[model samples]
Target chain A: GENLYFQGMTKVLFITANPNSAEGSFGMAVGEAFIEAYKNEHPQDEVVTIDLFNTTVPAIDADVFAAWGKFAAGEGFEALTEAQQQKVAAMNTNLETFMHADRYVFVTPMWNFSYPPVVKAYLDNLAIAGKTFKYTENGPVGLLEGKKALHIQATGGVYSEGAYAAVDFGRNHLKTVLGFIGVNETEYIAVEGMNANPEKAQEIKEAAIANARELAKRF
Target chain B: LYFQGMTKVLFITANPNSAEGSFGMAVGEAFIEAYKNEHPQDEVVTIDLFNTTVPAIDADVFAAWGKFAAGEGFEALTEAQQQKVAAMNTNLETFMHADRYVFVTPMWNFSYPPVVKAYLDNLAIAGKTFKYTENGPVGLLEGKKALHIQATGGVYSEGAYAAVDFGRNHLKTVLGFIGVNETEYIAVEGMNANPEKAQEIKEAAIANARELAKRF
Candidate 1:
């Protein structure tokens, strides 16, 4: 397997949000398993891990809005104010890092029926206008239409089935966003029923790990 | 307008855009202004999450949880953990103390801003906001209603992208989980989609927001 994508090394961006590592977190547990298997199977691929918890994600504050106005109106990056430059430059770097990646693997736990806050913050950087997607007369069309990604989500209760499935705004919303930006081939691995069925939490996590390992072989 | 019982309105906003600049903030301004006129005696508290520090569920948060899980006091926990715990608790207490909640945010990447999620995460204490039952989880903070004012670049209110609306869905789900069943969603959509008519569209929504405030 030399290079399946563009005859070059795959620039894999592995992102994690949970505080705990694989030891305590169900999503992180499966995430590590999946990435490790990917590394072992594809030794030539370059995988970069972004721990959002520790990383400084620039807040999209008033400075950003000020920067956006100046920059979008044919103004140079040097023309921005001190406060605007700081946030705009940092956010630009984050977006550049996202654009450089050929593959993305995000690991997050379901908090209050959705993924953690850091994941949302990290994503806010990637979903840029005229970069990730463009507005057309018809509608907003995704620029990166063929890119592939995966989101590993863990929840206490089983939100994948029954009437409760509609309430799963976590992974479901992720899919909507990814698809909006043209990552239509995005996949998901759910680690559920941890706190809901405390008696079977370990068993459920083991199953997710098994699924992740097998999925990575082809992924 | 002296009354024995008054409304405790929690006016929460997580947008970075100002009233003159952003669509969502403009709607919020219209709504809140009407609310104040209708109920001058009501108590209104505003929480701007961007200006406020909302600690993410990061490493220090876990470190704090570990100390609390053990038989340890506040001093036993490290300074970093203690700060995170205190900030999160303050957020929870603020949420619990409110009777009505209003979420004003712009739609970013098909959902609300990151700060809103962070604030909600802090509010979701296991034994406080919600608790698990036999079949599923149940919300504890009952008798509260919510209103979400969403501004979107595209027209996601209905039609082709209706199912793609995870912002309203997420807010509804989270609010329902926390026992806030009465949620009203009002969106000012197609701003970036129709730049020519965007202002006109916003004014219509603003009118509706003002009307809703009279009853809210």
Candidate 2:
């Protein structure tokens, strides 16, 4: 297959926050399987992985909030305290990495009908007021445009359709947040009902993996 | 009018450093003020999830729940796991004991702050708040009225971005899942976008909150 997305040295950022314990995670497995297939298909692309489990993504605290208050009120970075400066620099680097990527792949499991807190923390770091989005007279406008993303979601029950579709905040919220940050071009691959239908769990897992392999060739 | 069985009210707030220019914090305080004035005798417990270290539900936490599902007591877990379980139990107990719930939060990145999400993760214990049934999962807690007060910098509670405002919707959905079906939301929107209308918007929400406090 031809490289539809890869033009020259393309950068693919793989982000996942799966705990991957004894609970049998199709999300992590599908992520790895997709990466392997992608690499095999196009051996020339650079793939960077951000495993949120191993990373120390700090939750927003009083200090961070205070720093933002000052930063928003015309406080220069050089004038701020060393710790505040460091935090601001780290946030900038996160935003840079996200904006620098050619394409993004996010893999996560549905927790309480939504994505994990770690993923939310990552998005928090990226959604800066002036960097990712800005409030204009009409409304907020996304700054990071012309970006594409692929979401690989794993769920214990069927939430994509039926009555539960409205409550499927996992994928729905992610897509909305990503779109808010100007990444409107996105796709989804879900592995659903693994725990609800135990009899067809293996079959669903194989189908998700198979689907991932096909998407990787063009992703 | 006399307050019914609404003795205990649990206020779960997610305002980082309440002293800051946080409109959400102010709205939450306004809500509490009206609630206190209306129901002076009611016991109110405020848990600031941003100030507390509510740990994420990791593998160990899930394992502890598995043990609980297997009919194992909290003391049966390891020393480290016991500490985590103890913290989880405290959060769960605080939630379960509340006759009513008030969630005050800001719209961060079109959704809730990570700290609020962390608190929710701790409350999502299968046996405590919900249970697995042969049919599916059923919420254990019930008959509680909830109020979600959200403050957003931009206009998201309505207008073009209403559908994309996942933060408020997510909280509503999660609260309903735990059997708190009678939930209401009051939003202070576009505070930053339109500075002139900020006070009017806030006053409107505060008035609505006061009205809800009496009926709630």
Among all candidates shown, the one with the greatest TM-score: 1
TM-score of every candidate relative to the true structure? 0.92, 0.90
lDDT of 2 at A130: 80
lDDT of 2 by residue, B11-101 (tens): 8888875724778778788888888999987989988886676878777777887898899897878887888878877888888988888
Residue pairs in clash, model 1? none
A38-142 per-residue lDDT for model 2 (tens digits): 999989889998878777565566667768778789987766677766776777777788888888999988888888888888888887778888878776778
* Runs in model 1 lying further than 4 Å from the true structure: A1-7, B1-5
DockQ of each: 0.77, 0.69
After TM-score superposition, the amount by which residue A199's alpha carbon in candidate 2 deviates from its true location, in angstroms, is 0.4
Model 1: per-residue Cα lDDT over A10-34, one tens digit each: 8998988888888888898899999
- What's the CA error at residue B194 for candidate 2, in Å? 1.9
TM-score attained by chain A of model 2: 0.89
- Give residue B159's error in model 2 in angstroms: 4.8
